[PDB]
Amino acid sequence: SSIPGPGYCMGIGPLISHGRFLWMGIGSACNYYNRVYGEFMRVWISGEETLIISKSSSMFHIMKHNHYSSRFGSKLGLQCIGMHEKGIIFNNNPELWKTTRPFFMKALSGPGLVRMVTVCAESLKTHLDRLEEVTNESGYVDVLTLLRRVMLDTSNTLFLRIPLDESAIVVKIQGYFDAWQALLIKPDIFFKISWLYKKYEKSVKDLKDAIEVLIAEKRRRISTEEKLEECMDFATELILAEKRGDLTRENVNQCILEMLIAAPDTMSVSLFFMLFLIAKHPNVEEAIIKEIQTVIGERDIKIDDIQKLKVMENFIYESMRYQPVVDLVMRKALEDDVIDGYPVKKGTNIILNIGRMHRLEFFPKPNEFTLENFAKNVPYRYFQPFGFGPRGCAGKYIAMVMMKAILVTLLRRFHVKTLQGQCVESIQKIHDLSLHPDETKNMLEMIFTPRN
Ligand code: HEM
Ligand SMILES: CCC#CCO[C@@H]1C[C@@H]2[C@H](CC[C@]3(C)C(=O)CC[C@@H]23)[C@@]2(C)C=CC(=O)C=C12
């Protein structure tokens, strides 16, 4: 069928677009190149061809077959932040990836997914008898660093459980994400002028060295113990695999890291966006308290409830459709294929633009936020906010539980207030790797007024 996209200019074809992704910020570059040519087109990030796609048919095809379970990015960047064939999020060695994902997939379901909905209510509960840590003088709570703090402590007590410094680590993880986000597609010339990037290369070793402290401890607690099988946790499952011949110590440490940053990065920023949507929508928030009062009143939160909370479930989705945090997924092709009647060579990078695709396709009212787009049981072949298949979101299940938990235990106890004329559409956002709010502005603060 032959391929859309800007003219290849004999040397300049790539050089514009790549540069454009650089000055624009990945997120918007796709959101741009997708409107200029089709919902299926081609650009050049580095040498290699790269397809940027939003047609739900193409989407589905890619996430579904196995020959697409790999991502991409500057080898030197991934090398610099630690994920060059070591993590999972961006681990690209399909055998080495395949042998690790098990461990994540394991601890983010089944036994520990029942323990989550109760450790999630615990960490947020304890940090709410402690607003003295996040509130202005004029009573403004810095919501983000509240979430980031509890989200990480949730992550700790579930997967690692080692006494740590909450406040200190939260920033370091934030400095890490910065770097990750910078060096991901910085073309190889970048990496030569060192007085341009050790900038980041130090705030990496900053977090990395700070975690090596924790796992050194978690290791000793293992080798002097009250009989092993008692208490299996994502940490130990790994360190034990290492104490066989299954895993590099180098590789463990990056996984234990990829696990603690995982929730803070993504959850906090999503729950921020929800908390702003609740404030700006007065009637929606009622429906959620009604649903709460009905199913729970003033009982403790417990596992069995989360299916019954159907309205809030609906909310969480509609936020994620309308206001994504992750709006593009990067995959790579490993075998050649015809996809949507198109020829795709192996080694082509794919950027699936799921954030646009959510406004282009199935939904009744794509451009306004309403719980209406979710009165009609949704296909999941049309609304794919986590992904699926062999390399979809490893958390996707435990994720939707945490949100349900923290969203409830918090909306239980406080009415929320935006600041002035601020809505989620009037905040100012970076749009590079993810789509997250810009923290070089102010007005990202909120006011918590009690209930009953
Ligand atoms: C609610 C917030 C979250 C969103 C919006 C989200 C979404 C995504 C998406 C779109 C991907 C790309 C996978 C694909 O190609 O389909 C992904 C991957 C991944 N997610 Fe999440 N996720 C969330 C929460 C979490 C949590 C809480 C964890 C860990 C506790 C997590 C762990 C991971 C990991 C480890 C990967 C890489 C999987 C792999 O390729 O090996 N995610 N997530
Ligand atoms: C701080 C703002 C943010 C964020 C979340 O997005 C980040 C970046 C995500 C990554 C998963 C794979 C994604 C979706 C891509 O292929 C392109 C961007 C990638 C993800 C979701 C997984 C765990 C993690 O810890 C942080 C993130």
Swiss-Prot record:
Positions with a binding annotation for heme: C393
Single Gene Ontology BP annotation: androgen catabolic process
Any one of the GO CC terms: membrane
Top EC class for this record: oxidoreductase
Alphabetized UniProt keyword annotations: Disease variant, Endoplasmic reticulum, Heme, Iron, Lipid metabolism, Membrane, Metal-binding, Microsome, Monooxygenase, Oxidoreductase, Pseudohermaphroditism, Transmembrane, Transmembrane helix
Tissues in which the protein is found: Widely expressed, including in adult and fetal brain, placenta, skin fibroblasts, adipose tissue and gonads.
Membrane in keyword set: yes
Residues given in the record as substrate binding sites: D265, M330
Keyword Transmembrane helix: yes
Pathway recorded for this protein: Steroid hormone biosynthesis
Annotated phenotype, changing R148H: In AROD; strongly reduced aromatase activity; 81% reduction of androstenedione metabolism compared to wild-type
CDD domains (alphabetical): CYP19A1 (cd20616)
Membrane topology per record: Multi-pass membrane protein
InterPro entries: Cyt_P450, Cyt_P450_CS, Cyt_P450_E_grp-I, Cyt_P450_sf, Cytochrome_P450_Monoox
Membrane-spanning intervals of the chain: 259-279
Subcellular location, principal: endoplasmic reticulum
EC identifiers of the protein: 1.14.14.14
Cofactor: heme
Reactions this protein catalyses: testosterone + 3 reduced [NADPH--hemoprotein reductase] + 3 O2 = 17beta-estradiol + formate + 3 oxidized [NADPH--hemoprotein reductase] + 4 H2O + 4 H(+); androst-4-ene-3,17-dione + 3 reduced [NADPH--hemoprotein reductase] + 3 O2 = estrone + formate + 3 oxidized [NADPH--hemoprotein reductase] + 4 H2O + 4 H(+); androst-4-ene-3,17-dione + reduced [NADPH--hemoprotein reductase] + O2 = 19-hydroxyandrost-4-ene-3,17-dione + oxidized [NADPH--hemoprotein reductase] + H2O + H(+); 19-hydroxyandrost-4-ene-3,17-dione + reduced [NADPH--hemoprotein reductase] + O2 = 19-oxo-androst-4-ene-3,17-dione + oxidized [NADPH--hemoprotein reductase] + 2 H2O + H(+)
Disease per UniProt entry: Aromatase excess syndrome: An autosomal dominant disorder characterized by increased extraglandular aromatization of steroids that presents with heterosexual precocity in males and isosexual precocity in females.
Family membership: Belongs to the cytochrome P450 family.
Main function: A cytochrome P450 monooxygenase that catalyzes the conversion of C19 androgens, androst-4-ene-3,17-dione (androstenedione) and testosterone to the C18 estrogens, estrone and estradiol, respectively. Catalyzes three successive oxidations of C19 androgens: two conventional oxidations at C19 yielding 19-hydroxy and 19-oxo/19-aldehyde derivatives, followed by a third oxidative aromatization step that involves C1-beta hydrogen abstraction combined with cleavage of the C10-C19 bond to yield a phenolic A ring and formic acid.
Protein name in the entry: Aromatase
Organism: Homo sapiens (Human)
